[PDB]
Amino acid sequence: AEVYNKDGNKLDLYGKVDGLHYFSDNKDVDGDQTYMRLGFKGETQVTDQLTGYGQWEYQIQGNSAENENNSWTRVAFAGLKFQDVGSFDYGRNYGVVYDVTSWTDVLPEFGGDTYGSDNFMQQRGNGFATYRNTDFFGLVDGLNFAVQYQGKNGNPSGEGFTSGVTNNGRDALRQNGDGVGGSITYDYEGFGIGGAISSSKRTDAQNTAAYIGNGDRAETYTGGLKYDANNIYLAAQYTQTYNATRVGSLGWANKAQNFEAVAQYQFDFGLRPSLAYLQSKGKNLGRGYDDEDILKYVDVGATYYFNKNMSTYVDYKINLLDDNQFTRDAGINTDNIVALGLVYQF
């Protein structure tokens, strides 16, 4: 909701409360999943061509008791945009791989989980410096590209580590070294095609015998297709990763091949059914695991939009993984999940 617009500065204060419940035999996910998000998007006109902006978004869990608080920053960045030349921002933001993989990240509740957060340049993460160019300097409508750098996020400070430390250090599964990435998308009428590549130095803490998927760099190669016209939405993405896809708690996949596809239809009266399939196939994983499915599920659901501020949904995760030694070892969910949600937003 635009709560301020005066003297060249605008502030949008936005958010949502999602009253959400999961039903599953996996009791680690089963039960109340209520959460809220809150954010702001501000923009200031410096000149006719130059605009400044800032964006921040925060999630606060609404399913805990009052003696605990589970909350986190999703994004937090500041930037400058110059008409027909480009934009630059720095902060906690999305990796440029998500420019393409976000196209299938449209399910009512599930989806978008062949990758995670703080997972190299694949989704949300710290220390992204991002250049974006829309419509190729204004010369080619629908052609967008982006170039991105991510600074190292290493070992925790003040804990006796003698190398690889950064001020904002963390556990090895969420670390990264210096990284570079780029994306390109082209949309013409209903159709969209896109590609993205990222390459990040892996840290010394990540490359130990404690974790599968050792290697000098974490790399991803992604291609995507889209159709978004005439009340239909179709999308698919394929990603091949090296030492980049997490395998539960075990570390990373030496190689993974990830695939997501989605089909949706929007009825005039507000109902939007959705069908999706997601898989992540791990190769040469190590420790005698050889090849294993990391993720495999069909998703069927629907959202009903009352209007722009209110919706409700059902989502059914049909989990095709089987309970075996590998999934137990990695802590990967193999159970079905049904989610029921009622969402107010502003």
Residues belonging to the binding site are 319, 321, 334
Tokens of 339: 């989610």
> Cβ(36)–Cβ(17) under 8 Å?
yes
- Out of 104, 110, 114, 126, which residue is the one contacting its own copies (CB under 8 A)? 126
Based on CB atoms, which residue is closest to its own copies, 254 or 333? Answer: 333
Q: Which does 288 bind (CB under 5 to 8 A by kind): its own copies, ligand D12, Mg ion, none?
A: none
| Residue with tokens 């760099």, as numbered in its chain | 217
- Catalog residues that contact ligand D12 under the rule CB under 6 A: 23-25, 182-184, 193, 195-197, 221-227, 234-238, 240, 257, 259, 261-263, 275-277, 336-338
| Interaction of residue 334 with Mg ion, rule CB under 5 A | yes
d(CA 56, CA 37): 11
Nearest approach in angstroms of CB 138 to its own copies is 22
Would you say 235 or 295 has its CB closer to ligand D12? 235
343 binds its own copies (CB under 8 A): yes
48 binds, among Cl ion, Mg ion, its own copies, none (CB under 5 to 8 A by kind): Cl ion
On whether the CB atoms of residues 105 and 261 are closer than 8 A, the answer is: no
Question: Please, which residues have CB within 8 angstroms of residue 317's CB and are 6 or more apart in sequence?
Answer: 110, 297, 299, 336, 337, 338, 339
Element (H, E) at 100: helix 98-101
| Contact window for Cl ion (CB under 5 A) among 25-33, 64-72, 192-200, 239-247 | 64-72
Among 126, 148, 280, 319, binds Mg ion (CB under 5 A): 319
Distance of CA 83 to the CA centre of its chain: 28
For residue 330, the 8-state DSSP code is H
With CB cut-offs between 5 and 8 Å by kind, which of ligand D12, Mg ion, Cl ion, none does residue 205 bind?
none
Asked if 345 touches its own copies (CB under 8 A), the answer is: yes
Instruction: Rank residues 288 and 308 by Cβ distance to its own copies and give the closer one.
Output: 308
- 117 part of the interface to its own copies, by CB under 8 A: yes
Give the nearest distance from C-beta 25 to Cl ion in angstroms.
Answer: 31
Q: Which partner from the list its own copies, Cl ion, Mg ion, none does 283 bind, CB cut-off 5 to 8 Å by kind?
A: none
Task: Report if residue 48 touches Cl ion, rule: CB under 5 A.
Answer: yes
- Residues forming beta bridges with residue 86, ordered by sequence position: 82
Q: Is 42 in a helix, a strand, or coil?
A: strand
By the rule CB under 8 A, 92 interacts with its own copies: yes
Residue list, annotated binding site for Mg(2+): 319, 321, 334
The dihedral built from the CA positions of residue 37, 315, 259 and 210, taken in this order, carries a sign that is positive
Residue in 174, 175, 184, 178 with CA at minimum distance from that of residue 221: 184
Residue with tokens 């800032």: 54
Please tell me whether residue 47 binds Cl ion under the rule CB under 5 A.
yes
User: Using an 8 Å Cβ cutoff, are 79 and 53 in contact?
Assistant: yes
Q: Which parts of this chain interact with Cl ion (CB under 5 A)?
A: 47-48, 69
